[PDB]
Symmetry: D2
Subunit: 267 residues, 4 copies
């Protein structure tokens, strides 16, 4: 097992097609003992996570709640047992109000909406790291989920801005995490058909947005020298596991592209 | 005159060592007619700008004020005369509460403070562009001021995060600005001794921050193959002018490094 | 005149649709006095350059010839007059044998052919700089022509490899050029319909290569927020002039994208 | 075993402090069956490789020899047995004549010397891939060794140019390798004290070169948020193994930084 005996917190499970669902699944298949956090529908998350190959305690964490964050390390050492520490943290959390993404014009997202999106999608990566670094082992590993924001793209709008901020946060958390013997890195995934992503191709955020996102995915798979299957999250899940393992021991403040090699190719 | 007959709005003058002061000065030396915006001490800004080689109307603009932004294009066409449009916009605005920069630990900046900094330093670049694109000529040019955030650095902390968000905003404003025949670009400047920067090397934000910033500047000048003079803002001012001119007509969504070539060199 | 009184060597004119032809034209329109170099058909180059707005001495330079390079600065100070120096050098030279570009498979280009291409397209940028730096003024400027090699693309093959090597050479020539007070930079141009580029879209190097190159150009213009006109080299010519001028005084070891902003956009 | 049952060719062992030595060692500790190639002193390489935890056939390969390359896949299937294929190729080969690296001035390396260096250090990555792709399994993995050439640095000179060319080659080999179901990637290592690197810090290539290289290493370890130990190649070896495994299944045409996170930090 790649992850044998490691104890690892995985956030971000909301449905069984959440990228964090598959990260959890692969991590357990690989020997890891998990603690899970979930945001707002804990009954639902409890029922989805019943499906994982092994039981895992589930704690509530709303990344905008000072109090949840303040108590987090206590609730975790409670769940894993006093004198035990975390080897791994997975941040797989993201959100942008719909005004920052539609065919809703880029200049019309108001700042309260984008600030909410950056709070949850970028800043929260530092918050998690602050709450959890005190309970991590030397040799530990924090991983977040990224979508390559280095060129602008249609429809993603402020969510791309949010990702740009995240990558920058990640280089700072790596500075802090290093004092603990801990790595911090991002996985830049190719587009994956979550519920939300399907809703958007189906037009939930405007028809032209849906059309641009559909073209985005097809181009991705054409460029990728090994192809990209948007319906299969397990290559991303394996990549997060690769970072949680002892096999990337000199990589930090960094970004690993789990995207079919698409970003390396112009067409 | 590089900028002959162009009409250009320059924001961000607060003292005579503001990078926007010198941008204004060089632009006027080069034939430009200016409109100036200023934030909170308009009496002071009025008195500093008296020093520019030519008179220029001064309008108040607090980039966090919906109302100032809503009225901005009216106040400007008023100042430049109905049926006249802007050829140029300079965004030279930046701020981060001191909790997001000290030896104040990176994980301790609260989100309200960083959100304030991102509002003013990143989001405001889109706001300015939204208010002003309706009154710009085809062939126009929007320029903002950047500090290369692509690697983390000591002390700059959340301000670097704010710059990462800005560069991403800039690639989106370029999408919008293109519909108007307008370029949008950033100038990534080397460190320049503003009042604030001096205050920090003098220790205003903690002694170790001051020491890291001093080391930052010295390394910069050593790497720069043509050297870097932190006391001279005029090479940056000329670069902003180069972008405001007709001489970079195919560059947009882009970043021009006015930094002595330092970012191209490891040591 | 942007370039008034500057003396500037422009290499690379072969026909009237050479990017160096237009660089020469715009530079002369802008006040520059030129010296021209040309490679193998000097009678032809003489006749094409008769068309420039002003006369210019023409010297022969085969960048693979040790002797031409050894004598170059002598022939130039002869043409510009003893005690006069160059303010500007334009390198607009490139070549790759057809085995390194066809539908000719990437793995089949033999090393002698690629070495020839790298010699002329990458190494020669250092050679020119070595021959000419002794006769350049402080404040001078060397500019080469680049095609963004940072992602692989169909058909360009080893020429992209050659461009990657060039950009790296450029960061080193900037180290040397700095000792003389001289900037060194690259202009990354969008695709431009030279004779050769037309020959390729017409299928000179295989039908699928021609088809991939045609798709390359169309994507370019779609992404570019201000569009890209492959038939108009004058926006690139103006950009080279912007670098030859005093208006980018703190940029070196660098790359300026004259590409419609296409590289900043994913789609 | 991370690499259980995989068959893997590792080139580049010359002494027991070769990065390929440790790659071989870790790969064998991890279940891999190896075939080894070696360049010019095969008796010596035979004796060094006796030290590996398991026996491995050793074949001669001079990457500049057309004939060695032409016969390579035959000699390998001979060594691994007909109907068996390679899962892994490690390219850990590099060389630049000393004229392209000293305090020997950058402009004085003659083209024959740099062409030799690029042949062996960059082009040879495509040659290996051409010889070996016919004998690789779907799901296979080719890995080369890189030193981040994205900024110029003292003393490395033309070897940095050679690395820039390599990274570009790698993005093309990924295009070819994809048709076979095969990944191609580079590991960008921090500086490691091979014999050669020690010789250089000891001044073999000039005193100021030695001094710049010493400063290079110290800066590296200061920037690296998790530090860098130049005497320990095993974190790099583990990284190459991470790429040879099934745990990075969606990464190709890419670069993984095994460098302590140093490239993500300015100071
Ligand atoms: N789906 C795609 O094509 C790609 C997604 N990503 C990133 O993957 C990560 C996971 O998203 P997906 O699995 O795709 O969608 P998802 O919707 O399954 O996951 C998003 C998670 O964020 C959690 N969340 C939202 N607000 C929260 C808050 N205040 N506190 C705590 N948690 C909160 C949600 O409960 C949900 O579990 C996100 O960062 C996303 O940006 C990266 C690349 C591609
Ligand atoms: N000084 C340095 O070493 C470098 C500075 N920069 C950037 O240059 C730009 C200008 O800053 P400097 O001239 O260095 O300092 P400065 O303090 O002279 O300029 C900052 C300007 O931001 C304006 N501002 C702050 N909040 C505002 C608000 N709510 N509305 C409108 N304006 C507001 C201030 O009034 C001031 O005029 C900033 O974006 C800065 O980040 C970029 C590279 C280097
Ligand atoms: N055409 C395009 O779409 C783009 C071209 N570029 C670059 O622009 C530069 C100029 O090429 P173009 O004007 O497009 O084509 P061109 O064919 O007009 O110019 C190429 C020049 O290289 C010169 N040359 C070849 N071998 C030489 C040698 N041994 N010594 C001296 N000169 C030699 C040729 O005589 C010719 O004048 C090249 O570096 C090219 O790679 C950059 C971006 C786009
Ligand atoms: N040592 C360092 O600080 C770093 C080295 N690298 C790269 O690691 C790779 C391995 O080099 P090291 O282990 O450091 O040194 P090394 O000297 O142990 O390995 C170099 C290998 O290249 C082989 N070689 C040279 N010419 C050859 C030819 N014609 N045919 C076949 N093989 C040939 C040599 O026999 C030797 O085994 C090289 O690509 C190097 O550039 C990357 C980052 C850092």
């Amino acid at each position: 097992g790649l992850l044998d005996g490691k104890r690892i917190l995985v956030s971000g499970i909301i449905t069984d097609s959440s990228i964090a669902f598959h990260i959890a699944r692969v991590a357990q298949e690989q020997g890891a003992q998990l603690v899970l956090t979930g945001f707002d529908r804990l009954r639902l998350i409890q029922r989805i996570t019943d499906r994982l190959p092994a039981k895992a305690p589930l704690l509530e964490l709303d990344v905008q709640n000072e109090e949840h964050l303040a108590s987090l390390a206590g609730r975790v050492t409670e769940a894993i047992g006093a004198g035990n520490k975390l080897d791994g943290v997975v941040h797989s959390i993201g959100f942008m109000p719909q005004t920052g993404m539609g065919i809703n014009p880029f200049f019309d997202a108001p700042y309260a909406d984008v600030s909410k999106g950056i709070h949850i999608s970028a800043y929260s990566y530092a918050s998690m790291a602050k709450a959890l670094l005190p309970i991590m082992n030397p040799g530990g590993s924090i991983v977040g989920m990224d979508f390559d924001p280095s060129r602008a793209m249609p429809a993603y709008n402020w969510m791309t801005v949010a990702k740009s901020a995240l990558e920058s946060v990640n280089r700072f958390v790596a500075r802090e995490a290093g004092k603990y013997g801990v790595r911090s890195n991002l996985v830049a995934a190719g587009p994956i058909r979550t519920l939300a992503m399907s809703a958007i191709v189906g037009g939930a955020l405007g028809e032209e947005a849906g059309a641009q996102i559909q073209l985005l995915e097809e181009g991705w798979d054409q460029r990728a020298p090994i192809g990209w299957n948007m319906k299969d999250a397990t290559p991303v899940a394996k990549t997060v596991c690769a970072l949680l393992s002892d096999w990337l021991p000199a990589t930090t403040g960094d970004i690993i592209y789990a995207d079919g090699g698409a970003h390396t190719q112009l067409l």
